[PDB]
Amino acid sequence: FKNIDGYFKIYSKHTPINLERDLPQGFSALEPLVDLPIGINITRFQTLLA
Amino acid sequence: NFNGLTGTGVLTESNKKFLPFQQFGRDIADTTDAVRDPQTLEILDITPCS
C-alpha cells in the first residue's frame, strides 16, 4: 500500500509456499490490481479479523 | 494518441506478449516503440516514421 497524491496503487500477488516457517526465500513480482483515485491524508491503519 | 501518449510513427502488428496490466512500452533508450489498443486487446509495434 502506498500514499501517492491521488492514487493508492494497491499491489498484490498470490504464490504457493511450502516452507511454512517464515517468509520464504525467492523473488516474486507484485502485480498491480486497482488504482483507486482517493486523495486523502492517511497516517494510521488497522486491519480486521474474522 | 493512446490516453495522452502522443507521437508519430507506423503501427505494425507486433509479436510481443504484454502483461494483463501493462499497456505502454519503451526500449532501452526510453523510447516508446510498443503499445496496445485500450479498446481492443492487440499489441501494436510503433516503428518511427520514415
What is the spatial distance between Cα B37 and Cα B43, in angstroms, rounded to a whole number? 7
Give B19 to chain A, closest Cα distance, Å: 9
Q: Does A32 touch chain B (CB under 8 A)?
A: yes
For residues B21 and A31, the answer to whether their CB atoms sit within 8 Å is: yes
- Resolution in angstroms, to 1 decimal, for this deposition? 3.8
- CA A14 from chain centre, in angstroms, equals 11
- Please tell me the number of Cα atoms within 13 Å of A4 on its side-chain side: 10
Residue whose entry in the numeric block shows the C-alpha cell 494518441: B1
Contacts of B32 (CB under 8 A, 6+ apart): B5, B7, B24, B25, B26, B46
Experimental approach was cryo-EM
- Please tell me the number of Cα atoms within 13 Å of B47 on its side-chain side: 6
What is the spatial distance between Cα B38 and Cα B27, in angstroms, rounded to a whole number? 20
Judging contacts by C-beta atoms under 8 Å, the chain A residues touching residue B19 are 31
Of the candidates A33, A34, B7, the one whose C-alpha atom is nearest the C-alpha of residue B35 is B7
